[PDB]
Design a protein around this ligand. Structure first.
Ligand SMILES: COc1cc(C(=O)OCCCN2CCCN(CCCOC(=O)c3cc(OC)c(OC)c(OC)c3)CC2)cc(OC)c1OC
Ligand SMILES: CCCCCCCC/C=C\CCCCCCCC(=O)OC[C@H](O)CO
Ligand SMILES: CCCCCCCC/C=C\CCCCCCCC(=O)OC[C@H](O)CO
Ligand SMILES: CCCCCCCC/C=C\CCCCCCCC(=O)OC[C@H](O)CO
Ligand SMILES: CCCCCCCC/C=C\CCCCCCCC(=O)OC[C@H](O)CO
Ligand SMILES: CCCCCCCC/C=C\CCCCCCCC(=O)OC[C@H](O)CO
Ligand SMILES: CCCCCCCC/C=C\CCCCCCCC(=O)OC[C@H](O)CO
Ligand SMILES: CCCCCCCC/C=C\CCCCCCCC(=O)OC[C@H](O)CO
Ligand SMILES: CCCCCCCC/C=C\CCCCCCCC(=O)OC[C@H](O)CO
Length: 381
């Protein structure tokens, strides 16, 4: 088992980047979708876009990670991975074209929501199939996917900041997002196609030659990863983007405080947390400390809620200084990426090799169940 040059590891890293960089770029272009709806409409469509997008994203994402966990064995992995990648590529290509064509508000809203359902439907299959595949490899190769996903969040943050500072129209920034995603998806496909000729890949993928029982074996890590993202999506981004600076010296802060202090902070430390797990995985697959630290994250709900949210009707600002918010976001984000990566890395290793693929697929569903439960909870918070 010699991953010569770490080619397979790097390919798995690129696969993670590819799974989320398009969707992350889509999310960072929300301002383009809402502003486009406002300049078209003559209870509005922009006022409901975020909530309808959320519903059109989590419900498909959850349904198809669930189905994949039950049916991944009936479809070849290359069909599930390459087929999903090609579908997402086509949808983002269309998303890019719609930037340049005139279309009334309601058709644009509807067509966009349809594409959002396809992105998360094929995204579910893609992600469920990647973690299942990675379940056959050492734990470090699931961390490669998680790490690559974190970089996708980092690039998304850099793009958001650069778009604001560019001064360009939201539409031409969004068009750049979507074209970049298309190119990244194409690169991701090329990298995947290079795996079969690598001996390290064939060595663990060779091992292909009772869902209820598998679920019991990974239940601790499956439920932990679910609780990780219940908290995370519960608080981020819907709640945290409402925080305002209390030390800003210039009106130039206003448009940069959130993309910098919130989004950039989160994606930097989330990415670094995921990346650390490729080399350092304390407390280990059997330690009860891992679920315990996942539980401890509950503390971030009061902490962040009592930061400088303005306007606010009912609570007080206990932590008004920006430093509190940035610090909470860093620990909030680092604990997410690190513990989440540990859960995904360890889940498949609580089971025999012939079941590690299904274990990874189930872990993907519970990760997405956490995303969905967080969206529900955050829609009260
Ligand atoms: C497709 O699979 C995933 C989806 C999400 C995901 O979509 O999370 C959010 C869930 C609920 N959201 C619904 C969709 C829209 N969104 C609001 C979009 C506006 O947000 C952003 O601009 C944004 C920018 C970022 O970077 C600049 C982010 O970090 C990457 C980000 O994360 C949610 C959102 C609300 C929350 C997260 C994942 O791993 C972390 C996935 O991999 C399993
Ligand atoms: C903002 C920073 C961006 C972060 C960027 C990601 C960091 C990459 C991590 C580890 C490199 C390990 C990869 C080792 C290089 C392998 C290249 C390879 O594929 O080797 C075979 C090649 O095709 C024939 O020479
Ligand atoms: C059970 C989880 C399914 C619901 C998750 C979801 O779709 O999010 C709620 C949305 O915010 C509602 O508009
Ligand atoms: C890491 C810190 C990087 C954060 C850099 C923020 C970029 C920014 O806000 O720049 C202001 C803009 O140039 C004004 O027009
Ligand atoms: C929240 C983090 C704690 C995770 C605990 C998960 C658990 O206890 O698993 C129960 C399962 O039913 C055992 O078979
Ligand atoms: C804006 C400045 C932020 C950018 C800073 C770039 C830092 C590089 C990435 C993560 C650092 C955290 C520790 C990195 C350890 C990663 C382990 C690794 O990549 O090696 C995996 C290899 O394949 C073994 O199997
Ligand atoms: C960034 C904040 C978290 C740093 C924790 C860390 O990286 O600890 C590494 C440890 O020393 C590995 O031996
Ligand atoms: C460690 C987290 C950093 C904690 C930052 C404390 C900031 C603070 O409370 O200072 C108040 C400020 O000085 C009033 O003007
Ligand atoms: C920062 C908030 C804490 C993040 C929780 C994960 C920290 C971690 O796991 O680091 C292990 C540490 O080295 C123990 O020896």
């Amino acid at each position: 088992p010699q991953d010569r040059y770490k080619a397979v590891w790097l390919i798995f890293f690129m696969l993670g980047l590819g799974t989320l960089l398009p969707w992350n770029f889509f999310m960072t272009a929300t301002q383009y979708f809402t502003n486009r709806l406002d300049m078209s409409q003559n209870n509005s469509l922009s006022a409901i876009f975020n909530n309808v997008m959320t519903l059109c994203a989590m419900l498909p994402l959850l349904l198809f990670t669930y189905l994949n966990s039950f049916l991944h064995q009936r479809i070849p992995q290359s069909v599930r991975i390459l087929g999903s990648l090609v579908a997402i590529l086509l949808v983002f290509l269309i998303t890019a074209i719609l930037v340049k064509v005139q279309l009334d508000a309601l058709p644009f809203f509807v067509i966009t929501m349809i594409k959002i359902v396809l992105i998360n439907s094929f995204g579910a299959i893609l992600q469920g199939s990647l973690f299942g595949l990675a379940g056959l490899f050492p734990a470090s190769y699931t961390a490669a996917i998680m790490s690559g996903q974190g970089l996708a969040g980092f690039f998304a943050s850099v793009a958001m900041i650069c778009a604001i500072a560019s001064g360009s129209e939201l539409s031409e920034s969004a068009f750049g997002y979507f074209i970049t995603a298309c190119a990244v998806i194409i690169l991701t496909i090329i990298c995947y196609l290079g795996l079969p000729r690598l001996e390290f890949y064939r060595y663990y993928q060779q091992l292909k030659l009772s869902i209820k029982a598998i679920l019991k074996k990974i239940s601790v890590l499956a439920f932990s990863v679910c609780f990780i993202f219940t908290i995370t999506i519960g608080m981020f981004p819907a709640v945290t983007v409402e925080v305002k600076s209390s030390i800003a010296g210039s009106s130039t802060w206003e448009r940069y405080f959130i993309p910098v202090s919130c989004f950039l902070t989160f994606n930097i430390f989330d990415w670094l947390g995921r990346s650390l797990t490729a080399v350092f995985m304390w407390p280990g697959k059997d330690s009860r400390w891992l679920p315990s630290l996942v539980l401890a994250r509950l503390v971030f709900v009061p902490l962040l809620l009592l930061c400088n949210i303005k306007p606010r009707r009912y609570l007080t600002v206990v932590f008004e200084h920006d430093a509190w918010f940035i610090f909470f976001m860093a620990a909030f984000a680092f604990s997410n990426g690190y513990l989440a990566s540990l859960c995904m890395c360890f889940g498949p290793k609580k089971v025999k090799p012939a079941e590690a693929e299904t274990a990874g697929a189930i872990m993907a569903f519970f990760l997405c169940l956490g995303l969905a439960l967080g969206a529900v909870f955050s829609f009260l918070f």
